[PDB]
Design a protein around this ligand. Structure first.
Ligand SMILES: Cc1ncsc1-c1ccc(CNC(=O)[C@@H]2C[C@@H](O)CN2C(=O)CC(C)(C)C)cc1
Lengths: 104, 87, 141
């Protein structure tokens, strides 16, 4: 089963899909091809929770119910500067304007 | 070149599969590996990217298609973006 | 031109609504006039009596948005080995623009399309809402 994801760090968002049976490490390889940082310099998160490399995406809570094309699940991403990992930190998207009176 | 970068008006960088982006005639033309959108904010561009995924997944599919959701608060701007990007 | 054929040969059909819309079935009569039929709630089915060569299409009952039936626009009942013909009614993959137009129309009264801060061509797109006539004067073209 395909799961549909947004991998997010700071102001970067990667839209991609993966198999529910694929691993967290395998997702880091995907990220490596795109952002050119190796898996050992990456941490992936679900919400505040650090994910283990060997776990499947399904075991980390990414399923067809929660990770749909039109509403993908978010995976947090943090890089290691050199010695230490940065704190997980996702800039929110912009706020929509107030509903015009005619729509309210 | 598997991926392209779509940059919102507020600086958010959206990385999507090139073939997903190329479904917009406008984006194809702007590429022909990064595109800046001075008028499209991130809360609209994120949804645009979700639409790509939705379209590619459900086009020419015997499965039951779910509704593509749009919150009222983004509907106007998303409409303007969809008109511009032609889709 | 687009009209049911008067075959008088019965054909049983299951209208199966696999969409989240309330569905309006429309039969094209022998003169090609659209006849509305009773609506189907989301996820419901009805076994109905129709005829071979009769023409149907399916709409959102509230908005007249176009729907698909077995992946196409028109459905024609065919010969039944005893069993009914399945008519699978689904949402199309709307363009993002059409989907946005749908949502804006559901929130804004037609009087006030003109008060929206948008280019003239988008007012025209809102006002030109889905309509069986235009679709028939198109399918028949
Ligand atoms: C119960 C129901 N719900 C959604 S549609 C529906 C339904 C469907 C069919 C019928 C009875 N069948 C008819 O009216 C058929 C359908 C179409 O082929 C035209 N028709 C006719 O009998 C020809 C006619 C209308 C007598 C000239 C009654 C109700």
């Amino acid at each position: 089963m395909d799961v549909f994801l947004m991998i997010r760090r700071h102001k970067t968002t990667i839209f991609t899909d993966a198999k529910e049976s694929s691993t967290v490490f395998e997702l880091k390889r995907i990220v490596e091809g795109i952002l050119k940082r190796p898996p050992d310099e990456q941490r992936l998160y679900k919400d505040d929770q650090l994910l283990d490399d060997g776990k499947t995406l399904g075991e980390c809570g990414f399923t067809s119910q929660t990770a749909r094309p039109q509403a993908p699940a978010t995976v947090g991403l943090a890089f290691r500067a050199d010695d230490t990992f940065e704190a997980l930190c996702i800039e929110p998207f912009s706020s929509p304007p107030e509903l015009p009176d005619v729509m309210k | 070149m598997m991926y392209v970068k779509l940059i919102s008006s507020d600086g958010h960088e959206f990385i999507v599969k090139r073939e997903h982006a190329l479904t917009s005639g406008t984006i194809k033309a702007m590429l022909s590996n990064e595109v800046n959108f001075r008028e499209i904010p991130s809360h609209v561009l994120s949804k645009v990217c979700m639409y790509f995924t939705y379209k590619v997944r459900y086009t020419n599919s015997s499965t039951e298609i779910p509704e593509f959701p749009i919150a009222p608060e983004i509907a106007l701007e998303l409409l303007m973006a969809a008109n511009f990007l032609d889709c | 031109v687009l009209r049911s054929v008067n075959s008088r040969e019965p054909s049983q059909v299951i209208f199966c609504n696999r969409s989240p819309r309330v569905v309006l079935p429309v039969w094209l009569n022998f003169d090609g006039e659209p006849q509305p039929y009773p609506t189907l709630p989301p996820g419901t089915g009805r076994r109905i009596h129709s005829y071979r060569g009769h023409l149907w299409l399916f709409r959102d009952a509230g908005t007249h948005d176009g729907l698909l039936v077995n992946q196409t626009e028109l459905f024609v009942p065919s010969l039944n080995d005893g069993q009914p013909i399945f008519a699978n009614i689904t949402l199309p993959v709307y363009t993002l623009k059409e989907r946005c137009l749908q949502v804006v129309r559901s929130l804004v009264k037609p009087e006030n399309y003109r008060r929206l801060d948008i280019v003239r061509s988008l007012y025209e797109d809102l006002e030109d809402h889905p309509n069986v006539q235009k679709d028939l004067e198109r399918l028949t073209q």
